[PDB]
Every structure is written in structure tokens, then in C-alpha cells.
Design a protein around this ligand. Structure first.
Ligand SMILES: Cc1cc(Cn2c(N3CCNCC3)nc3c(-c4c(C)n[nH]c4C)cc(Cl)cc32)cc(C)c1F
Ligand SMILES: Nc1nc2c(ncn2[C@@H]2O[C@H](COP(=O)(O)OP(=O)(O)NP(=O)(O)O)[C@@H](O)[C@H]2O)c(=O)[nH]1
Ligand SMILES: [Mg+2]
Ligand code: NA
Lengths: 469, 167, 166
């Protein structure tokens, strides 16, 4: 038979499942809704482990339970009463013999030890992967240190001593590859001559590589704490989502820099060379699976100032028109081809973050926090699972590093790019559009001629890499 | 067969804009949503006895990608310009959204509707007369909607389709 | 994208977690933090086909030995890991092999035998002894180092191929 349980009066997590406290989706069960007590019971269940559920719960629980209350509840879960001696044990003791204690030994082995170990696994994941709760609440950290540091008894001792050390390391807080990264490529600008760095003087291969390293690092830095609760859209977004906003602002700046390079090149022949170089950079972004970079270029070529430059378009080689067309097609039909390509490539890659943001926001806004059943309010956990499926996908692409060498000067050049200068956004984007009108006026105004601005060769070195010995 | 209308929702973030399309496309009567589902933004409807397909682009949450607005707007035949009736800044943003749509579409007469959205019980700061006056100054309809009761939601999208049909 | 459920098993301290984190993150973990149960995901192209690996990293400490049936039921293939400088961990392999067969009620479960820590000079389990055991199980034997990456992709992706041909 099943093990008997403590009385639900002394141990709250022994209450029977009912539709008044837990609802399952239609081989472990998947929870649709439940009380916080039932969620924590199943988070630390004696019959099976559920590592996905641990991640889902620890990513999303603050929408229904405060951190201080979660810790109180898992300490309550940990403190399981042992059953009293049975009749057979009683009779043995009355005869001066040692009891077999069969039921007690089974309850320890099959209920207490698995539940307690799974409580410690929640603590371990909490500290290792969601430590911001403790960074933001020093008293919560004190309570966790005290709880772990006072767990007695040898069955848990290895994990208790380990978790104590992990906490201490987290308070005061290297890549190996299958091959060597390729050699850094140089064009007109030579190493150390940062004052000459520009769109046409750096090598287009190396522009794409260094922007991919930068954009990969920005992508990898975004934590789920910046996303859950849609906090990057709210009034405190600069406090709660700084790495996400830094990533988006880089993308915006690069798109505007591409537009500025195009429309401030007033000579038609030179502007064709500028656009051609940008499409070559896009080609290397595609080869590197840097989809953020691909869309940075596509957004610039579809912007109002650039899109209308028909005289420039007319001189772009047919093959480059095709590269841009196939990049634009990734975004069509609500990113249908992009989503399929992302799921087919071999990482490393840099995803476009915007789709994730819209899906998290709409999942939050479009589903209720609670479900009302039999007069009770149950936490709608299915909604949180959907959010954590998105944050899980984000995290999966954050693991793989690029095998590319950093060039510190080129990196700094792109980190410090500031196309808008001190201008506000409206002022600057009006300026770009007025430049577009100046260099290619609306019909029937005649097309003017403009002097060259570049004194160095415009011929591209191409985007196939070189390899000396 | 039937006509497809590509509609684009634009407006300030952080103030409940996404409720407009969610409530429309939703199982009207079951309050639930998976936006990742292929065609969670396509809806066949009958407007003035004529069946059509609405394809709605709502990039809510991507407002900080400000250099992508042209890319997204270029796809649209008609636009819902949404502000929150308890957020004056979102209302003051409308002029620039409209100017940007006119520029992307290269037209002074782009089908659009002004939508004032009630996203919570916080005090209204934009009165309906202010918004009606703004809409009239632009020559476009004004619709008010509730983010919670679905009131006005059908009217906003159907009015925009009529603006496209009568362009 | 086909999904594959891989499970990494073996005695405490043999390097199950270090192997998994090297595969997932290209990083070698120097600390010895005993695992309770961890899970990882990895999208990767293997033999021209994209798949999604779900990797369960299990507890080797004996105090967790009564909690294994639940993860053995879910797994589709098993990396059976010992350390080549730890003869006791090699002797523990057959206990994992027999338990997996019982739980899945099958003589034909996808498995790979992994001899880890092959960067260390002071070997105590000879390759021949491990290879003989693997042949008796009908499975390949791959020596690995979570520290240097030697053999790591080969071990995990050979297991994927086993599941695919099962
Ligand atoms: C190559 C190029 C393109 C554009 C602006 N633009 C144009 N133009 C065609 C001509 N009339 C104006 C609009 N087509 C595109 C395409 C696209 C699609 C879809 N199918 N095939 C293509 C090529 C993709 C993108 Cl992202 C931008 C596009 C401006 C300049 C300066 C330029 F050099
Ligand atoms: N030299 C060397 N050390 C290794 C290798 N793999 C793991 N180690 C070291 O061995 C120790 C144990 O590694 P770990 O991955 O935690 O082992 P485990 O099998 O996961 N242990 P557990 O079963 O308790 O979770 C760590 O100090 C780790 O750095 C390897 O290939 N070479
Ligand atoms: Mg481990
Ligand atoms: Na206001």
C-alpha cells in the first residue's frame, strides 16, 4: 500500500489533492493551476524530480509569492514529522527486543529523504541561478544561510556543506574550443590606427566579426529577471532591465549609423559603394548566424531615408539585391522564415530579441493571474509555464560562445559609436530624411551631382577570408 | 477569394496597448492567449456583410527598437494609433506617430483611426473632448476602448477597415 | 527538430557535471559541487540533422541511490560514466547498467560507456578492461576529458546516433 502521511493538521503538505487546490492539464503530470502550497508540494514531490518545473517556478514565482514567503514555505516543507512506532514495534519493545521499525524506515527512505533532498535542490538552484533575490534583500540571504547551515543529520550533509560553500562564493563573485579562431583581417585601416577606422576602411569581414562578438555578449548578458513581469516596459525599466536596454540601444545605434553613412555620402558612385559594403557585412552576419545583425541592416535598408534612394538601388549588383531580398524575407509573415531558420542552424547564433519580448508581454497580458474554481482562487500556473518556455529558449542560445578573436580597438570603436551625437531622436531622424531628399530629390526635381568625399580606394576586399601560413 | 487587410497597431509602450488586439483575436469568451501560435493575429470577420481576413501586426514590447518602426509600418495598409486615457505623454506622442506613418507610406492620406484605451482604474487624464478635437484636426475617426471589458474593440478595427474600403 | 532525452549517470565525482557543462558552455568546472539533479538543453546539428538535446545530470552520491527509477523511466539514452583513475567507479558501472535495464524492462537501451579524466596520467582502469565490458554490453566505449574537451562531443553525439538508430 501507499505510505501513510502526517496529519494535515500538523503538516500542511499532506492535504489530499482535489480540484479545490490543484488542477492538472489533460509521464509526470503537468500542473494547470493550484494553491501555492500544492505548487510547492509538487515542486519537491516524493515520487519524482521535475527539474524543468524547478526552473519554471524559480523564474516566475514572484508574480504570486514573495521571496521571503517562498523561503518560509520551503522550510516548512523540509520539516517533516516522523511517524510513531507501530503495533509490531510496540510489542517488540515490550519484550525487550529491538523493533524492526519497517514503516518508519520506509517513510524515511521514500518520503522524507527525497522531499528534503528536493527542497535542497530548490535552494541550490535558487542560489546558483536566481541569486538576485539575495542581492536585493540581505535579510533573505541571512535566513537562507542560517537554514542551510543548521540542517542536521548525515543523509543531507554532503549537499548542506556544498550549498554553504556555493552561497559564500556567490557573495564575492574561461572558454576552451575545438579549434583556433581565424586570423583577424585588415583592409585600409591598419592595426593601432583607430583614428582612421570607418565603414569603408575596416575590413568588412572584421566589422561583421567584431559586431557579432559585441552583439553576442550583449545577448548573453540578459537575465530572466529583466523580462518576467514585463518590467522592461514599465516606469522602472532602467533599473530592472539595464542589460536588455543596453542591447536594444546598441542595435538601434548601429541601424542609425548605417543610415547615416548612406545618406551623408552625397556622391552617387560613393554611396553605391557604401550600400554595397553594408550588404557584404550583412552576408557575413548571415554566415555567422548573427540574426540581430542581419535585422540591423534590413531595418536600415527599409528606413524612410534609405528605402527611397532609387538611383542608388539601380546600381547595386543583382546578386546583392538577392542577398538583401532573402534577408528581408526572414521577417515577412510575422517572421515565419526567421523562426524556422533559427530552429535549424547550428549555434552559436545571436537571436533577434524583439520577438521574445512581444511574446512574453502578450502572454502576461492575455492570461489571468488566477483561475476561480469551486469558490477558490488558484494560481494560474500554465501562464507562468508559457513565460518560462520563452525564457528557457532565450537561455539555450546564450550558452554557446563564438570562436572569434576580439580586436580591442575595433571593439572600442563600435562600443563608442554615437551617430545621433547630442541631437534628440526626432531632430536626428528628420535630418536623415532631409539629407535623403537633398541627395536624391523627389521627381520631377532634377538629380544633382555632388563631389567625392573619400580619398581612399572604394573597391571592397570582399568577404571571403584569407589564410597565410 | 476574400480580401486580406494588413493592419498595424502603433503607440506608446507600457500602458496596455496590447489588450486591443488580444481581446479582438481572443476566444472572445475565454480569457486566454498563446501569442506564439501561428495565426494568433489573423481573424476572419464579416464587416457590413462582406467577409474579409484581418492580419494584425502588434509589436507591443519592442518600442525601444525605435529604428525598426519604419520596417514594421511599411507593411501596413491601415493603422490604429493607440494612446492610454490615463497617460498624457502617450497622447502627446500621437502627432509624431502619424507624421512617421505619412512619411513611410509617402502619402498625406493614410487610413488610420485614433484609439483611446482605458487600461486600468487610475484616473483619466485625457478627456474625450481633447481626443475628439485631435482626431477631427486630422480628419480621422476616434474610438475609445476598454482593456478589460472588450468594449469598443470591434468598433476600432471595423472602423479602420471601413476607412480602408472608402479610401 | 527531433528531441532526444539523454541522461548522464555514474559514481560520485567521476565528472558527469563537468562533462555536461563542457558540452553546453565550453567551460571546465574545477569545483566539486555534488549534484542532486540538473537539466540542460542544447540545439545542435548532428549528421546534418538539427536536434534538441535534453540532458539530465544526475546524482552520483550514494545518499541519493534510492531516487533513480524516476529519471531512468524518462531517459531515452544513457551515458554511463566512470573515471579512469578510480577503479571503484568502474566497478559501479554494472549496477547502473542493470538498474537501467530493469526500469526500462529492456535488454536494448541506447548507452555509451565513458571513461572520463583521460587528461590525467595516473590511470588505474586500462582501456582494454573497459572496452571488454562495453563489447559485452554491445555499446561503444569513448574516453573523455571534461578539462581538455577530448572526446566530449564524440561521447554525447554517439549516444544521439544510438537513439536515432534504435
Ligand atoms: C538594394 C537597395 C534597396 C533599397 C530599398 N529596398 C527596395 N527598393 C526597390 C526599389 N525601389 C525602392 C525600394 N527593395 C528592397 C528589398 C527587396 C525586396 C523586398 N525584394 N527585392 C528586394 C531588393 C529589401 C529591402 Cl530590406 C530594402 C529594399 C534601397 C537602396 C538604396 C538599395 F540599394
Ligand atoms: N582532471 C580532470 N578533472 C575532472 C574531469 N572531470 C571532472 N573533473 C573534476 O572532478 C571533480 C568532480 O567533478 P563533477 O563534475 O562534479 O563530478 P560529478 O560526477 O558530477 N559528481 P556528483 O555525482 O556528486 O554530481 C571536480 O573537481 C572536477 O573539476 C576531467 O575530465 N579531468
Ligand atoms: Mg554532478
Ligand atoms: Na497622465
Amino acid at each position: 500500500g501507499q505510505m501513510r502521511l502526517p496529519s494535515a493538521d500538523v503538516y500542511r503538505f499532506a492535504e489530499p489533492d482535489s480540484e479545490e487546490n490543484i488542477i492538472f492539464e489533460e509521464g509526470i503530470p503537468i500542473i494547470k493551476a493550484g494553491t501555492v502550497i500544492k505548487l510547492i508540494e509538487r515542486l519537491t514531490y516524493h515520487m519524482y524530480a521535475d527539474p524543468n518545473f524547478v526552473r519554471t517556478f524559480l523564474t516566475t514565482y514572484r508574480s504570486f509569492c514573495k521571496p521571503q514567503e517562498l523561503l518560509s514555505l520551503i522550510i516548512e516543507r523540509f520539516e517533516i514529522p516522523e511517524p510513531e512506532p507501530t503495533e509490531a514495534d510496540r510489542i517488540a519493545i515490550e519484550n525487550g527486543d529491538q523493533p524492526l521499525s519497517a514503516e518508519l524506515k520506509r517513510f524515511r527512505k521514500e518520503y522524507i529523504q527525497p522531499v528534503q533532498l528536493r527542497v535542497l535542490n530548490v535552494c541550490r538552484h535558487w542560489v546558483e541561478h536566481h541569486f538576485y533575490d539575495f542581492e536585493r534583500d540581505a535579510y533573505l540571504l541571512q535566513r537562507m544561510e542560517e537554514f542551510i547551515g543548521t540542517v542536521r543529520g548525515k543523509a543531507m550533509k554532503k549537499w548542506v556543506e556544498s550549498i554553504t560553500k556555493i552561497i559564500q562564493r556567490k557573495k564575492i563573485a574561461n572558454i576552451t574550443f575545438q579549434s583556433s579562431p581565424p586570423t583577424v583581417e585588415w583592409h585600409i585601416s591598419r592595426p593601432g590606427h583607430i583614428e582612421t577606422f570607418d565603414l569603408l576602411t575596416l575590413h568588412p569581414i572584421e566589422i561583421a566579426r567584431q559586431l557579432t562578438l559585441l552583439e553576442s555578449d550583449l545577448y548573453r548578458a540578459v537575465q530572466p529577471s529583466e523580462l518576467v513581469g514585463s518590467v522592461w516596459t514599465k516606469e522602472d525599466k532602467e533599473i530592472n532591465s539595464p542589460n536588455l536596454l543596453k542591447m536594444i540601444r546598441h542595435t538601434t545605434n548601429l541601424t542609425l549609423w548605417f543610415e547615416k553613412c548612406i545618406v551623408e555620402t552625397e556622391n552617387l558612385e560613393e554611396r553605391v559603394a557604401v550600400v554595397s559594403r553594408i550588404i557584404e557585412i550583412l552576408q557575413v552576419f548571415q554566415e555567422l548566424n548573427n540574426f540581430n545583425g542581419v535585422l540591423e541592416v534590413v531595418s536600415a535598408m527599409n528606413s524612410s531615408p534609405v528605402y527611397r534612394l532609387d538611383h542608388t538601388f539601380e546600381q547595386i549588383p543583382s546578386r546583392q539585391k538577392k542577398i538583401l531580398e532573402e534577408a528581408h524575407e526572414l521577417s515577412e509573415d510575422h517572421y515565419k522564415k526567421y523562426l524556422a531558420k533559427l530552429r535549424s542552424i547550428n549555434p552559436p547564433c545571436v537571436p533577434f530579441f524583439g520577438i521574445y519580448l512581444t511574446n512574453i508581454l502578450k502572454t502576461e497580458e492575455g492570461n489571468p493571474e488566477v483561475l476561480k474554481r469551486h469558490g477558490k482562487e488558484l494560481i494560474n500556473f500554465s501562464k507562468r509555464r508559457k513565460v518560462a518556455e520563452i525564457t528557457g529558449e532565450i537561455q539555450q542560445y546564450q550558452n554557446q560562445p563564438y570562436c572569434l578573436r576580439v580586436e580591442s580597438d575595433i571593439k572600442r570603436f563600435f562600443e563608442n559609436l554615437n551617430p545621433m551625437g547630442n541631437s534628440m531622436e526626432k531632430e536626428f531622424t528628420d535630418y536623415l530624411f532631409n539629407k535623403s531628399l537633398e541627395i536624391e530629390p523627389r521627381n520631377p526635381k532634377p538629380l544633382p551631382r555632388f563631389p567625392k568625399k573619400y580619398s581612399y580606394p572604394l573597391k571592397s576586399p570582399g568577404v571571403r577570408p584569407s589564410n597565410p601560413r | 477569394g476574400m480580401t486580406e487587410y494588413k493592419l498595424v497597431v502603433v503607440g506608446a509602450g507600457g500602458v496596455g496597448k496590447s489588450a486591443l488586439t488580444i481581446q479582438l483575436i481572443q476566444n472572445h469568451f475565454v480569457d486566454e492567449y498563446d501569442p506564439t501560435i501561428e495565426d494568433s493575429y489573423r481573424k476572419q470577420v464579416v464587416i457590413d456583410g462582406e467577409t474579409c481576413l484581418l492580419d494584425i501586426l502588434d509589436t507591443a514590447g519592442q518600442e525601444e527598437y525605435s529604428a525598426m518602426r519604419d520596417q514594421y509600418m511599411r507593411t501596413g495598409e491601415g493603422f490604429l494609433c493607440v494612446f492610454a486615457i490615463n497617460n498624457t505623454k502617450s497622447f502627446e506622442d500621437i502627432h509624431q506617430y502619424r507624421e512617421q506613418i505619412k512619411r513611410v507610406k509617402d502619402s498625406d492620406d493614410v487610413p488610420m483611426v485614433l484609439v483611446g484605451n482605458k487600461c486600468d482604474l487610475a484616473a483619466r487624464t485625457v478627456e474625450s473632448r481633447q481626443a475628439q478635437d485631435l482626431a477631427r484636426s486630422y480628419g480621422i475617426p476616434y474610438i475609445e476602448t476598454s482593456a478589460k471589458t472588450r468594449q469598443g474593440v470591434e468598433d476600432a478595427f471595423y472602423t479602420l477597415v471601413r476607412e480602408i474600403r472608402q479610401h
